[PDB]
Structure formats: structure tokens, C-alpha cells
Design an enzyme around this catalytic site. Structure first.
Site, PDB file in Angstrom:
ATOM      1  N   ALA A 214     -13.944  -5.171  -3.708  1.00  0.00           N
ATOM      2  CA  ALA A 214     -13.456  -3.828  -3.647  1.00  0.00           C
ATOM      3  C   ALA A 214     -14.449  -2.928  -4.640  1.00  0.00           C
ATOM      4  O   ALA A 214     -15.431  -2.299  -4.151  1.00  0.00           O
ATOM      5  CB  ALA A 214     -12.143  -3.392  -3.827  1.00  0.00           C
TER       6      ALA A 214
ATOM      7  N   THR B 164      -8.562  -1.496  -2.506  1.00  0.00           N
ATOM      8  CA  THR B 164      -7.992  -0.225  -2.891  1.00  0.00           C
ATOM      9  C   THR B 164      -9.267   0.701  -3.135  1.00  0.00           C
ATOM     10  O   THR B 164     -10.145   0.149  -3.785  1.00  0.00           O
ATOM     11  CB  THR B 164      -7.023  -0.212  -3.760  1.00  0.00           C
ATOM     12  OG1 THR B 164      -7.535  -0.446  -5.190  1.00  0.00           O
ATOM     13  CG2 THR B 164      -5.955  -0.978  -3.632  1.00  0.00           C
TER      14      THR B 164
ATOM     15  N   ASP C  51       0.899  -1.009  -0.079  1.00  0.00           N
ATOM     16  CA  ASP C  51      -0.104   0.117  -0.120  1.00  0.00           C
ATOM     17  C   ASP C  51       0.910   1.310   0.014  1.00  0.00           C
ATOM     18  O   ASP C  51       1.829   1.331   0.917  1.00  0.00           O
ATOM     19  CB  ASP C  51      -1.028   0.037   1.217  1.00  0.00           C
ATOM     20  CG  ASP C  51      -1.972   1.051   1.066  1.00  0.00           C
ATOM     21  OD1 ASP C  51      -1.655   2.104   0.951  1.00  0.00           O
ATOM     22  OD2 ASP C  51      -3.336   0.885   0.972  1.00  0.00           O
TER      23      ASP C  51
ATOM     24  N   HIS D 236     -22.839  -7.784  -6.032  1.00  0.00           N
ATOM     25  CA  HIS D 236     -22.272  -6.558  -5.189  1.00  0.00           C
ATOM     26  C   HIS D 236     -22.916  -6.621  -3.787  1.00  0.00           C
ATOM     27  O   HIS D 236     -23.607  -5.890  -3.392  1.00  0.00           O
ATOM     28  CB  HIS D 236     -22.747  -5.058  -5.763  1.00  0.00           C
ATOM     29  CG  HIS D 236     -21.800  -4.259  -5.284  1.00  0.00           C
ATOM     30  ND1 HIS D 236     -21.332  -3.044  -5.928  1.00  0.00           N
ATOM     31  CD2 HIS D 236     -20.938  -3.899  -3.938  1.00  0.00           C
ATOM     32  CE1 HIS D 236     -20.596  -2.389  -5.291  1.00  0.00           C
ATOM     33  NE2 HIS D 236     -20.368  -2.857  -4.100  1.00  0.00           N
TER      34      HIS D 236
ATOM     35  N   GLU E 187     -22.331  -2.861 -13.696  1.00  0.00           N
ATOM     36  CA  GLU E 187     -23.008  -3.654 -12.751  1.00  0.00           C
ATOM     37  C   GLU E 187     -24.559  -3.315 -13.056  1.00  0.00           C
ATOM     38  O   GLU E 187     -25.101  -2.142 -12.962  1.00  0.00           O
ATOM     39  CB  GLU E 187     -22.933  -3.089 -11.556  1.00  0.00           C
ATOM     40  CG  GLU E 187     -21.376  -3.764 -10.885  1.00  0.00           C
ATOM     41  CD  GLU E 187     -21.139  -3.366  -9.380  1.00  0.00           C
ATOM     42  OE1 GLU E 187     -21.880  -2.772  -8.769  1.00  0.00           O
ATOM     43  OE2 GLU E 187     -20.022  -3.696  -8.910  1.00  0.00           O
TER      44      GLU E 187
HETATM   45  C1  K58 Z   1      -5.067   2.984   2.668  1.00  0.00           C
HETATM   46  C2  K58 Z   1      -5.725   3.576   1.565  1.00  0.00           C
HETATM   47  N1  K58 Z   1      -4.945   3.060   0.323  1.00  0.00           N
HETATM   48  C3  K58 Z   1      -4.868   3.453  -1.007  1.00  0.00           C
HETATM   49  O1  K58 Z   1      -5.585   4.453  -1.182  1.00  0.00           O
HETATM   50  C4  K58 Z   1      -4.230   2.845  -2.012  1.00  0.00           C
HETATM   51  C5  K58 Z   1      -3.774   1.533  -2.121  1.00  0.00           C
HETATM   52  C6  K58 Z   1      -3.221   1.326  -3.438  1.00  0.00           C
HETATM   53  C7  K58 Z   1      -2.238   0.221  -4.011  1.00  0.00           C
HETATM   54  C8  K58 Z   1      -1.950   0.369  -5.399  1.00  0.00           C
HETATM   55  C9  K58 Z   1      -1.335  -0.542  -6.035  1.00  0.00           C
HETATM   56  C10 K58 Z   1      -0.971  -1.887  -4.996  1.00  0.00           C
HETATM   57  C11 K58 Z   1      -1.170  -1.950  -3.884  1.00  0.00           C
HETATM   58  C12 K58 Z   1      -2.066  -0.674  -3.186  1.00  0.00           C
HETATM   59  N2  K58 Z   1      -3.201   2.666  -4.066  1.00  0.00           N
HETATM   60  N3  K58 Z   1      -3.786   3.499  -3.327  1.00  0.00           N
HETATM   61  C13 K58 Z   1      -3.971   4.817  -3.454  1.00  0.00           C
HETATM   62  C14 K58 Z   1      -7.198   2.982   1.210  1.00  0.00           C
HETATM   63  C15 K58 Z   1      -7.528   1.660   0.965  1.00  0.00           C
HETATM   64  C16 K58 Z   1      -8.927   1.305   0.741  1.00  0.00           C
HETATM   65  C17 K58 Z   1      -9.850   2.475   1.071  1.00  0.00           C
HETATM   66  C18 K58 Z   1     -11.321   2.233   0.953  1.00  0.00           C
HETATM   67  O2  K58 Z   1     -11.642   0.886   0.976  1.00  0.00           O
HETATM   68  O3  K58 Z   1     -12.218   3.046   0.834  1.00  0.00           O
HETATM   69  C19 K58 Z   1      -9.554   3.863   1.299  1.00  0.00           C
HETATM   70  C20 K58 Z   1      -8.153   4.206   1.257  1.00  0.00           C
END
Ligand code: K58
Ligand code: K58
Lengths: 297, 302
Positions: free
Chosen positions: A229, A201, A169, A277, A259
Site C-alpha cells: 500500500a 489503507t 475498516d 514499488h 524510496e
Molecule cells: C475505504 C478507505 N479506508 C480508509 O481510508 C481507512 C482504513 C483505515 C484502517 C485503519 C486501521 C485498521 C484498518 C483500516 N483507516 N482509514 C482511514 C480507503 C482505503 C484505501 C484507499 C486507497 O487505496 O487509496 C482509499 C480509501
């Protein structure tokens, strides 16, 4: 001062708003005309997915200051039209965290043992022992891409099955993920190690097609993939090619780029498990979202 | 012991361990009663999984037979009475599938909580029935575990990670011992009213046949969900159907039946029943472990 609840909400939503001094009007399935009519003296509006908060509704509701969605998805709200009028749009992804993590874990277990396909076989009067020989989760590697609340909850549950939980992350520090037993590695090092991959994500340009032809080729042959997700994080055309070659042994999808999906090739594949969903579809999550949106107001 | 027939499809490690122990091995599958007896005429050992039926007729026609091993738990497909009368040793692998059975049990609990098999069937029928599904969140719910041996303990520790309250009963395992793996024991009569989900992990004995019956289903909380990945008959099949029809039971997940394959279709066909064709030990890993454990026992005998 006044809020309209236009979808079916748990009574806790209204009581929290009323304890905060707000006047609350609760109605369901109003027509576009009735919705506009009720909103004339409302500064607030609370919806789920049924009410369509279009450009026409926002532009007709002059006193409106906030649109609150009790849930995650805001596809029913015109974000452009709300921003055009200077309106803030609120949601409650936290309220759905547990139910989405629980469904993800269920999907992982379903991919290892093909319970949905075995039930369909039994209901067709078949007794297919050999066809549904599966795999044990103990000792397998789970790659968790996205280490926010949902990824963390999936990790601690799957650790109790003896799975090795690794991930990445770009926002969460390696120290934070180590605190919940997730070793972060550069994204390129993750692909060859995984037996299972799950994505948690937001959907952004950087996460669209995170799993694509190039990254599927870097995976271990027979990887199993979960997407509970958002539709589009896994490239659907690349996933079908990987299922066709055996590069991907199975996939579990709660979400789709469209969807309901109009291309049925993934849903119809024998190694694909799916739901319409249902990640947030529990009474507990719906009640929690209702509470969280009323607290925000 | 010089020659061993493996008559069912086993993990390749079984043949290799026997051979490394100096034994000749013949590997066959799907033999008729006549083909099996013919193959056994020069064998002192036989290794089976579940498809080969080691009946009295097979035992009595296999003069040189000294040992019958099953690469799996229990001995349903071996006539113990006939083996003892002929002085034949019967061996099996009691713990070879414990983790695989516990993992399937946990998958069944999740499938019942979120109607995953029903949702997949709906999608495969070209439908988007989001509005018709309402799942249950497991966190905070109570899971009753009846039987606290290896499999029940493994289910408990996994479901504890979901925030489920794990309670149960076992007359052999003490409440202090089960507390050490997070299972709170209460008198059996106090378990039924508290459970959201019940899973059974006892042996099949006269005392556990129909453990869940009309009487005990009435003592459950309305809408209880039940899992049986243990032995067919622990949950009375007629009582289960009656409880599903009234709504006293909201759903059930069955890996095992009193008759396999079941010719009575009432349970399998019920909308709130999810099922598998006895897949509890059907993993590459459990099969590898059972194959190893039985072959090591034969080599130890040599
Ligand atoms: C903690 C934060 N992580 C992120 O936003 C994130 C992860 C990744 C990522 C790209 C590539 C591989 C692995 C990971 N790129 N990004 C911007 C977050 C996660 C979930 C939510 C939600 O469930 O709404 C909100 C925020
Ligand atoms: C630990 C031991 N427990 C038992 O034998 C047992 C439990 C129960 C029981 C009756 C009523 C309610 C709840 C429980 N009655 N009995 C004799 C054991 C469990 C599983 C296996 C196996 O999986 O084969 C082997 C042994």
C-alpha cells in the site's frame, strides 16, 4: 482549452482529451526551462512520476488550473505550492487497483512458499529441499486492514484459496464488507487470529505505524505481513524486531518509508521479499490510468 | 507385519498411527545403503519419502520385507519391478499433496507475471530498478491447463478468481465435466495459439514426454509464459531453452527437472526462469497428510 502531457502516456490519453475538444501537446523529459516554456499557454498538465511539478514550475505557469497524475503517488507534485495558487491536483488510484491487488496476492503466495528465496538458491547452484519447507494457504486466516477497492479484490482472490478473510475498516460498513465475504471485527480482535496480515489503507496519521511493537506483540507468533500500500503503514523498526525474534515469520514489501530505502536491514533479511514499488507497474494499469485522467479532464 | 522402519524425515503422525495400530517403529534419517540394509533385517515394513532409494539391491538384501510405503505421490525412488519379483506390496498417497502443488503452481504464475523473484534479487543486490520492470496484469488473460485431474482443477478455480480465462485439454476428462469447474476444452491444437500462460498437470507418460517441444512452442502466442510443477520432462528442456532464447517463451517456472538436482544449468541460470528445488509437496500440511495416509494403510493391512 490546452493540456501538456509531459511524461510517457498511452495514446488513449491524448485521443480522449482531443475528443473532448482539448488541444494536446505531448513531449517527454523536458528540462525545467522547456517545461515552463511549454506550460505558458496550458491550463492543464498531465504527468506520471518523472515530471517534477515544483513550486518554481507552478508559479511560472499562470494559466494552469489542474495537474493530473496518471497513477497513485503524487510525491512529484508540490501540493502546498498548487494549493498556494488555488490549483486542484487530480490522480487515478482506481486505475491501479487490480495490478496492486494482484501483486499483493502474489506476495502472500511468495511468503507461504519462499519462491523468491528458492529461485536465488537454485541460481547459486544449490538444491535446498529442507530449507524451503513452507505452508499451505487453505484454511489459514488473512486479516485485511483497509476494505476499499484493493482490499476487496485481495479478499475475493484469496477466498478461492480457502483462506478465511477477516478485517477492519472504519469507513466501510460491516454490511458492505459482508457482501464480499469479509467479516469485520474490532481491530484488537483481529491481531491474534491472523496467519497473514495485509494493509490497504491510505497513509494518514491514524494509519502510520498501524503495525508497531505493540500490535506485533498482539499477533500470533509467526504471522506473515504484506505491505503493497504505502511505506510507513508498517513501522519498519518494529517489523525488523519482529523478524529478529520470529514473532513475524516473513514480510513482503513493495513500499518503504524512504524510496529507495537507505537502511537495508529489512531488504537484506532472509525472510523479507521485496520489489521496487511495482504495484502499478503493468502496461494494463498504466493504460487504465491514462484513460481515467483524460476522462477526469 | 510387526516392525516398521521409517528411513526419511516424516511428519510425527506417521510413527504415532503405526504405534497406535500395535506396530513397533524405528525412525532413522540419512542412512547409507549399508546402514539401511542393516536396519531392515528385522523389519516387515519400510516407509520412505524421497531420499531413501528402495533399489533392487536393498529389496533383495531385506529378506523379511513385506511392504514398502511412500509418504507422497508417485514411486520414483522405489524399484517396482524388484518389489513385484519379491512379492512386496508398494503403497503410496496419490492425493496427499494436491492442494500444495496447486498453490505452488498459482504462486509461480504470479511470480512470472510480476517478476517477483527477479525484483527481490535486484533489491537484495542494493538496486532500485523500477524503470527496468514491466509486469503483466492477469485479469482477462488466458491460462491453458493441460491435464485436468485434481491438481489442474484446483489451479483453474483459483486462477478464475483473478479473472483469467481458463481453457485446457485432457483426453480422460470430458468437456462437459471440465465445464462444471470452469475449464473450456478445445482440441489440443486450438489451445496453443490462445494462451498467455500454460501450465501442465498431466502424469509423465510416453504420450506426455515433450508435450511442449519445438513444434508446439512454435504454435504458441509469442511471449507465452510456461509453468511445470508436475513432472520433469513434460516440457522438453532443450526446446524450452531455445524458446526462451528467441523470445517465443517470455518466461518459465520450474519445480521439477528430468535430472534432480539438474547438472545441466542452462535453464536454471536463464534470466527469465524462476525455479524451486522440487517444493510442490513441501508444506507442513501436505507432509502431515501424506504421513497420515501411508500409516493408516499399514494399520489397515495389519
Ligand atoms: C475505504 C478507505 N479506508 C480508509 O481510508 C481507512 C482504513 C483505515 C484502517 C485503519 C486501521 C485498521 C484498518 C483500516 N483507516 N482509514 C482511514 C480507503 C482505503 C484505501 C484507499 C486507497 O487505496 O487509496 C482509499 C480509501
Ligand atoms: C485426469 C488424468 N489425465 C491424464 O491422465 C492425462 C492427461 C493427458 C494430456 C495429454 C496431452 C495434453 C493434455 C493432457 N494425458 N493423459 C493420459 C490425470 C491427470 C493428472 C494426474 C496426476 O497429477 O498424476 C493423474 C491423472
Amino acid at each position: 482549452r490546452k493540456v501538456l502531457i509531459s511524461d510517457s502516456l498511452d495514446p488513449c490519453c491524448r485521443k480522449i482529451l482531443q475528443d473532448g475538444g482539448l488541444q494536446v501537446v505531448e513531449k517527454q523529459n523536458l528540462s525545467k526551462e522547456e517545461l515552463i516554456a511549454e506550460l505558458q499557454d496550458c491550463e492543464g498538465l498531465i504527468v506520471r512520476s518523472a515530471t517534477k511539478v515544483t513550486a518554481d514550475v507552478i508559479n511560472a505557469a499562470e494559466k494552469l488550473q489542474v495537474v493530473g497524475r496518471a497513477g497513485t503517488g503524487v510525491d512529484n507534485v508540490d501540493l502546498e505550492a498548487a494549493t498556494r495558487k488555488g490549483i486542484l491536483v487530480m490522480n487515478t488510484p482506481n486505475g491501479n487497483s487490480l495490478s496492486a491487488a494482484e501483486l499483493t496476492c502474489g506476495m502472500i503466495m511468495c511468503l507461504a512458499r519462499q519462491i523468491p528465496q528458492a529461485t536465488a538458491s537454485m541460481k547459486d547452484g544449490k538444491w535446498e529441499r529442507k530449507k524451503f519447507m513452507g505452508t499451505e494457504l487453505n484454511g489459514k486466516t488473512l486479516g485485511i486492514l483497509g476494505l476499499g477497492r484493493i482490499g476487496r479484490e485481495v479478499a475475493t482472490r484469496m477466498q478461492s484459496f480457502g483462506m478465511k478473510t477477516i478485517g477492519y475498516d472504519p469507513i466501510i460498513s460491516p454490511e458492505v464488507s459482508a457482501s464480499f465475504g469479509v467479516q469485520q471485527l474490532p481491530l484488537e480482535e483481529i491481531w491474534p487470529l491472523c496467519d497473514f496480515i495485509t494493509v490497504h489503507t491510505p497513509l494518514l496519521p491514524s494509519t502510520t505505524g498501524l503495525l508497531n511493537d505493540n500490535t506485533f506483540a498482539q499477533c500470533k507468533k509467526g504471522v506473515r505481513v504484506v505491505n503493497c500500500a504505502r511505506g510507513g503503514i508498517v513501522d519498519e523498526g518494529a517489523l525488523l524486531r519482529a523478524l529478529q525474534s520470529g514473532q513475524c515469520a516473513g514480510a513482503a514489501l513493495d513500499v518503504f518509508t524512504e524510496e529507495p530505502p537507505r537502511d537495508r536491514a529489512l531488504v537484506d533479511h532472509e525472510n523479507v521479499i521485496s520489489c521496487p514499488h511495482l504495484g502499478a507497474s503493468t502496461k494494463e494499469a498504466q493504460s487504465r490510468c491514462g484513460e481515467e485522467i483524460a476522462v477526469q479532464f
